[PDB]
């Protein structure tokens, strides 16, 4: 509530790494990389459409999870919840490290292990508290931090004056196999949608504001990306093998003049902590939506949510079991698996806008039937282009979820179609 | 129909590689390997229980797929069908290669590429025809071939006289047994043969649950009374079999001389399981077809199985793997389908709980535990299976889902629907 603070969240929850994204992508060239932002933005825009439409037909508590529930039943709803709930706070631990690693990286306040681990846990509860007492208040905070974090990116254009960069300086491979290696970066840079969908229930004035923020935030972060990754791969820190090594930041203050004292990392650190609260917000939301139904422990619904702390207690437990102990083999990899979890809800939501809203089409049916087919292929490629290892455990999680469900809802479950009786 | 020909199928569809299994497992030792057959047989027996019970409460067309349908709805039923249907015939192409590769390997009739590829396609339709006109006739064939194939294994015990053979890669006893499961967990992908065989099978609700436990307990004895009767003492030490595929090695340290009649029947015990799987292929296809899920053609007039659509595909995917250059990508697929088979296994367990939570006894905790083992069983099997493979199993679910929401858009029955 209302619209303008939400449209910033939908975009903010995407750009928790918009400032650093460029260099990591410049490795696989940056000239024929823009020749790849299309495939990404097109597919990603198709997803923003689906969620925008699905939310206009049903402003839910809600999902995602909600849409999944209706579409496929209780099982896949319950499942959609867990996966997404985990991806929310498990994805948060990597955001504090990098978040704080932007404040104490340029001063440099403090750096050592047991020193940074405490200020992260500290700032975590700093946002866990803002959520448990101010849905409007937390949306204010993010709205503030995301605008600050945008100052640089929006300030970068300001184009003068690009200089023919490496164009296609990526590893020797056909233009097709070259763009494929660029998607491994761009496809995952739009895991910010559905922020309004689950934000519904709150958000207020939904059915309109949500679908608007869903397309707004995306079209905002879509411009930022292609009007930032271009305004740097030409001409500030070229050639490719100049940024390909060092993390961007102070490199934007030489080839057009800013001096420094770099005030860049001072706000690009808030644009990572501002997205902290937003995700914990969603965490408790999907948890409540589920809790309010026969699926997922009741405590997560108790006026915002009181069990918002169970997320905080866990985020801290999984903060210590990754920083202090040396390995870390498990804490380290788990943080990347949760990212794939986020793709399962994305999937079903599409299947939902079809299976459910096959009536409210227009019938501009083929047009809708196609947009959902793109968003489908989008999510599919994202998965494929993601090192085997990671995916393997996403699967094993489904494996567990399933068993975990049939062992907790044994009799509470409503079977279609049931047995006979004798 | 009736029982005795089916109990042999449930076991036959497990031992399509029971004769070769030993050596591949001897690599990771064979002494502390028996100290691993327990974990396997226990978990695998737990699965045979679930299916035996689930089928006694509902003799279905059927699944698996069927149980999955009731349990979770139409979507997961439809999905359970595809995955299992594919795993049936995609798993068949590797059975003809190895099957024929047991006849023309010891004579040796013929060996070359475009020569073996033709006799496989030939023997494929040889079983595709036996199925499209004789469910009893095909069960006769397998019943015959599986008994023949058992002659060696059952004849191996005959124990005299074992000789003291953990020679696996340096690793704690726990990490040593884990590497043994990568062989044993997957050696029991033969269950649920009777469950899907229901509808046919006749006299079900009893015969099926009996064959489900019978076949397993039969192939469970064969394994542990064969892998032991060889890792002691015929071809030891470990690094004697660890290199060469067993077969003629069982005719020196106790047995008769040349002319090995072993590979002559152990080739039929691989072709006899050919028809059985195509049988199930058309069965799960029909069961699904007979419901709103899966193309209608797979259910027709003739009182048996569109059983040819499977044959047409098995041939297309036979050529696109032997004659053609590449040629590896379409070879990985043959191993992915194996994991597909684990998804039905999963839901079936979830079913015997979610559905049959009444007919328990209530010996509830006892049932509630058996299903928990079979659960963990299927879970480990998946984990202990090189990332790559699993990744594409997931991508298949990805596709299946989209494939469904794009074909049953309006036919789908939504719980709970929208509004106005």
């Amino acid at each position: 509530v209302g619209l303008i603070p939400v449209t910033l969240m939908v975009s903010g929850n995407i750009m928790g790494s918009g400032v650093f994204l460029l260099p990591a992508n410049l490795a696989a060239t940056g000239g024929i990389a823009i020749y790849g932002w299309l495939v990404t933005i097109i597919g990603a825009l198709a997803l923003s459409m689906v969620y925008a439409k699905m939310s206009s037909l049903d402003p839910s508590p809600g999902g995602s999870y909600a849409y999944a529930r209706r579409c496929f039943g209780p099982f896949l709803g319950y499942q959609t919840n867990v996966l997404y709930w985990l991806a929310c706070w498990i994805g948060n631990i990597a955001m504090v490290v990098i978040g704080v690693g932007y404040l104490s990286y340029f001063f440099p306040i403090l750096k050592d292990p047991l020193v940074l681990t405490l200020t992260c846990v500290a700032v975590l509860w700093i946002f866990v508290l803002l959520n448990i007492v101010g849905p409007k208040m937390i949306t204010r905070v993010q709205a503030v931090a995301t605008v600050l974090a945008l100052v640089p990116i929006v300030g970068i254009a300001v184009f003068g004056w690009f200089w023919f960069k490496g164009e296609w300086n990526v590893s020797g491979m056909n233009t097709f196999g070259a763009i494929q290696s660029t998607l491994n970066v761009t496809l995952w840079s739009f895991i910010g949608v559905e922020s309004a969908s689950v934000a519904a229930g709150v958000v207020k004035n939904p059915k309109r504001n949500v679908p608007i923020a869903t397309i707004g935030g995306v079209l905002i972060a879509a411009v930022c990306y292609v009007l930032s990754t271009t305004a740097i791969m030409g001409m500030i820190p070229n050639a490719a093998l100049r940024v390909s090594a060092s993390p961007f930041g102070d490199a934007a203050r030489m080839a057009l003049g800013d001096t420094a004292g770099a005030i860049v990392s001072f706000c690009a650190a808030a644009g990572c902590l501002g997205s902290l609260g937003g995700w914990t917000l969603l965490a408790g939301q999907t948890a409540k939506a589920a809790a309010d139904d026969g699926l997922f422990p009741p405590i997560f619904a108790r006026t915002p949510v009181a069990g918002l702390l169970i997320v905080g207690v866990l985020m801290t437990i999984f903060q210590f079991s990754s920083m202090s102990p040396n390995a870390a083999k498990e804490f380290g990899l788990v943080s990347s698996v949760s990212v794939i979890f986020t793709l399962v809800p994305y999937l079903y939501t599409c299947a939902a806008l079809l299976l459910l809203g096959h009536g409210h089409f227009g019938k501009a049916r083929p047009l809708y039937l196609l947009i959902t087919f793109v968003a489908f292929v989008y999510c599919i490629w994202a998965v494929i282009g993601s090192g085997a290892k990671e995916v393997m455990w996403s699967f094993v999680t489904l494996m567990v979820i399933t068993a975990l469900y049939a062992l907790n809802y044994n009799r509470i479950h409503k079977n279609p179609y049931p047995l006979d009786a004798p | 129909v009736g029982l005795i020909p089916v109990t042999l199928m449930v076991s036959g569809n497990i031992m399509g590689s029971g004769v070769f299994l030993l050596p591949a497992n001897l690599a990771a030792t064979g002494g502390i390997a028996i100290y691993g057959w327990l974990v396997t047989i226990i978990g695998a027996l737990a699965l045979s229980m679930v299916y035996a019970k689930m089928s006694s409460l509902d003799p279905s067309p059927g699944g698996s797929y069927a149980y999955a349908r009731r349990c979770f709805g139409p979507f997961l039923g439809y999905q359970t069908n595809v995955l299992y249907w594919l795993a049936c015939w995609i798993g068949n192409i590797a059975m003809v290669v190895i099957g024929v590769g047991y006849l023309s390997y010891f004579f040796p009739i013929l060996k070359d590429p475009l020569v073996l590829t033709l006799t496989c396609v030939a023997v494929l339709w040889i079983f595709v025809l036996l199925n499209i006109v004789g469910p009893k006739m095909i069960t006769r064939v397998q019943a015959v071939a599986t008994v023949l194939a058992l002659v060696p294994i059952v004849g191996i015990a005959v124990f005299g006289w074992f000789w003291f053979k953990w020679n696996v890669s340096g690793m704690n006893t726990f990490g040593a047994i884990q590497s043994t499961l990568n062989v044993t967990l997957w050696s029991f992908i033969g269950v649920e043969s009777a469950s899907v065989a229901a509808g046919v099978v006749k006299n079900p609700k009893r015969n099926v649950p009996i064959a489900t436990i019978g076949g397993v307990l039969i192939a469970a004895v064969c394994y542990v009374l064969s892998t032991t009767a060889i890792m002691g003492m015929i071809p030891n030490a470990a690094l004697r079999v660890s290199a060469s595929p067993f077969g003629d090695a069982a005719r020196m340290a106790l047995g008769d001389t040349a002319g090995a009649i072993v590979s002559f029947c152990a080739a039929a015990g691989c072709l006899g399981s050919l028809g059985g799987w195509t049988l199930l292929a058309g069965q799960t296809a029909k069961a699904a077809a007979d419901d709103g899920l899966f193309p209608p053609i797979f259910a027709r007039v003739n009182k048996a199985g569109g059983l040819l659509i499977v044959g047409v595909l098995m041939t297309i995917f036979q050529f696109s793997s032997m004659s053609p250059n590449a040629a590896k990508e379409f070879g990985l697929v043959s191993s992915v389908s194996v994991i597909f088979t684990l998804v039905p296994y999963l839901y079936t367990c979830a079913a015997l709980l979610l559905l049959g939570h009444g007919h328990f006894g209530k010996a509830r905790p006892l049932y509630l535990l058996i299903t928990f083992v079979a659960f963990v069983y299927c879970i480990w099997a998946v984990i202990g299976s090189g990332a790559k493979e699993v990744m594409w199993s997931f991508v298949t679910l990805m596709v299946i889902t989209a494939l469904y929401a794009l074909n049953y858009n309006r036919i789908h029955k939504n719980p709970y629907p929208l509004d106005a």
Epitope: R411, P416, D420, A421 | G292, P415, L418
Partner: antibody
Framework: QVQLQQSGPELVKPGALVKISCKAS????????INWVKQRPGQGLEWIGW????????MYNEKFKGKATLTADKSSSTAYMQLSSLTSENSSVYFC?????????????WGQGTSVTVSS | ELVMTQSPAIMSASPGEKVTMTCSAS?????MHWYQQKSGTSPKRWIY???KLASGVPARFSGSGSGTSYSLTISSMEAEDAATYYC?????????FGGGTKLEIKR
């Protein structure tokens, strides 16, 4: 609001068959099932079967045959025949009913009821 | 073939009195449903998922139970409450209803 209302008639002669209708409105006819229950003279109600306007249908075992549930998507209603009626099988007002979902398991909307006498 | 056999068959109560009708069950089920049929007319949804109140149903009503024993109750009786209440299940096949409990007002 769901309406789901039916027809008042009619009397029947033993042996002959009847065809009762239930025209639904207020919701999309093809999103849910359509159920039928048979309530003897101020007595217990007996489920009969459902029918999916989408396609197929399930029928109560006891009343094997003796009735065929049909439907037309167009008219947004659903027919229902009683095959081999007999003097005693006389309604027992017949009700059409739609669940609130679907799947499982309680009827949220009932037809007004159709009284059926089968005498000569 | 899952019998409902609910009792009492017929009962009467004065306005303000606590009414309690039960519903046995052949074998254990999860969830039971109650409908309120007045004078032969089309039944009305009242108690779904064992303890859920329908749209209009007044707070005065309430349901409970599990396994084989379920029961519908009302704190204070009312003239309106007079009717026949039907317990019903869908936990197995086919779905079935009870004999009905006939509640009459006392005057």
């Amino acid at each position: 609001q769901v309406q789901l209302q039916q027809s008042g008639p009619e009397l029947v002669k033993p042996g002959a068959l009847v065809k009762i209708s239930c025209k639904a409105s207020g919701y999309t006819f093809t999103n849910y099932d359509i159920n039928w229950v048979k309530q003897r003279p101020g007595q217990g109600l007996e489920w009969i079967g459902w029918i999916y306007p989408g396609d197929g249908s399930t029928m109560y075992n006891e009343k094997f045959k003796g009735k065929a549930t049909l439907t037309a998507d167009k008219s947004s209603s659903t027919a229902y025949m009683q095959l081999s009626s007999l003097t005693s099988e006389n309604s027992s007002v017949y009700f059409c009913a739609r669940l609130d979902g679907n799947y499982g398991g309680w009827f949220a909307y009932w037809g007004q009821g159709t009284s059926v006498t089968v005498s000569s | 073939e899952l019998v409902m056999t609910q009792s009492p068959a017929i009962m009467s109560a004065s306005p303000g009195e606590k009414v309690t009708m039960t519903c046995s069950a052949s074998s254990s089920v999860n969830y039971m449903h109650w409908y309120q049929q007045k004078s032969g007319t089309s039944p009305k949804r009242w108690i779904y998922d064992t303890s859920k109140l329908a749209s209009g149903v007044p707070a005065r009503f309430s349901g409970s139970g599990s396994g084989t024993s379920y029961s519908l109750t009302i704190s204070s009786m009312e003239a309106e409450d007079a009717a026949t209440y039907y317990c019903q299940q869908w936990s197995y096949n086919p779905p079935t209803f009870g004999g009905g409990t006939k509640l009459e007002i006392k005057r």
